[PDB]
From Swiss-Prot:
Transmembrane segments: none annotated. InterPro entries: Ferredoxin-dep_bilin_Rdtase (IPR009249), Ferredoxin_bilin_OxRdtase (IPR022870). Its EC number is 1.3.7.5. The keyword DNA-binding does not apply. The keyword Electron transport does not apply. It catalyses: (2R,3Z)-phycocyanobilin + 4 oxidized [2Fe-2S]-[ferredoxin] = biliverdin IXalpha + 4 reduced [2Fe-2S]-[ferredoxin] + 4 H(+). Disulfide bonds: none annotated. It is an enzyme of class 1 (oxidoreductase). This is Phycocyanobilin:ferredoxin oxidoreductase. It comes from the Bacteria. Belongs to the HY2 family. It comes from Synechocystis sp. (strain ATCC 27184 / PCC 6803 / Kazusa). GO terms for biological process: phytochromobilin biosynthetic process.
Length: 240
């Protein structure tokens, strides 16, 4: 992240989360993943503020697509988006997070390990490791929208109330990533029917994430409807 244009000007929580994700991935058997049009940096404006986005994306044998995206709208909204899309053959859940901030602080902090099984449960080993973290206390919980049925029972969706809660959230993301990267070492290739089940779950996850009109409006205000539809369906939440 040393070379990032956006990092020095992002919200401090976002900065720490970007660092923690990058550190998680740094020593993995990474290969490039080329986004559409080999996208890296992009900016756009229409009648209002400009939107700037920086994209990084990788893959490993266990992770189809590892996407870390940083964005800023003018000087007033920052975003961090990250999804680790699993290779269905290994049946791992989806790591994701979305952190939205403005000059007044973080408004939204979401993180999850989301299921891909048809029973909508995480694998047993994840259930047990996540439970062992304890129920975190957060003073300003937010209720997921209906499309957020995709998220696990461990999903976080808060407005951090103070620095202690910002740090607690970051630590929980670090703990999610640690669990995930360990479970990826012990995963074995699954049967064809199980692989297919997991593929289905990933497709459903992406179709539901595309219902987030808050994200879509940010994109539309800077680039228009057609660009935003392409970005959400081809860059952010591609349907395999
Ligand atoms: C250019 C990219 C990008 C932008 C600009 C972005 C913006 C964005 N995401 C939001 C919410 C949200 N975002 C999520 C969740 C997620 N979203 C994800 O991209 C992932 C991976 C998850 C979860 C793992 C949820 C659940 C909400 C709340 C939606 C709502 O309030 O209706 C909001 C509303 C913040 C608030 O209400 O305080 C904005 C503006 N998200 C982005 O990804």
């Amino acid at each position: 992240l040393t070379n990032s244009s956006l990092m020095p000007t992002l919200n401090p929580m976002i900065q720490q989360l970007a660092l923690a994700i990058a550190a998680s991935w740094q020593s993995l058997p990474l290969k490039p993943y080329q986004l559409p049009e080999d996208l890296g940096y992009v900016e756009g404006r229409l009648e209002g503020e400009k939107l700037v986005i920086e994209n990084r994306c990788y893959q490993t044998p266990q992770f189809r697509k590892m996407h870390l995206e940083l964005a800023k709208v003018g000087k007033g909204l920052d975003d961090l988006h990250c999804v680790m899309f699993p290779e269905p053959l290994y049946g791992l859940p989806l790591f994701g997070c979305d952190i939205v901030a403005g000059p007044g602080g973080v408004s939204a902090a979401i993180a999850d390990l989301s299921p891909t099984q048809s029973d909508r449960q995480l694998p047993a080993a994840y259930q047990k490791s996540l439970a062992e973290l304890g129920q975190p206390e957060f003073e300003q919980q937010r209720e997921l929208p209906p499309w957020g049925e995709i998220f696990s029972e461990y999903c976080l969706f808060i407005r951090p109330s103070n620095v202690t809660e910002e740090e607690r959230f970051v630590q929980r993301v670090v703990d999610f990533l640690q669990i995930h990267c360990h479970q990826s070492i012990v995963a074995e290739p699954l049967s064809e029917a199980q692989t297919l089940e997991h593929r289905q779950g990933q497709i459903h996850y992406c179709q539901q994430q595309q219902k987030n009109d808050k994200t879509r409006r940010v994109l539309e205000k800077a680039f228009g409807e057609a660009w935003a539809e392409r970005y959400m369906s081809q860059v952010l939440f591609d349907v395999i």
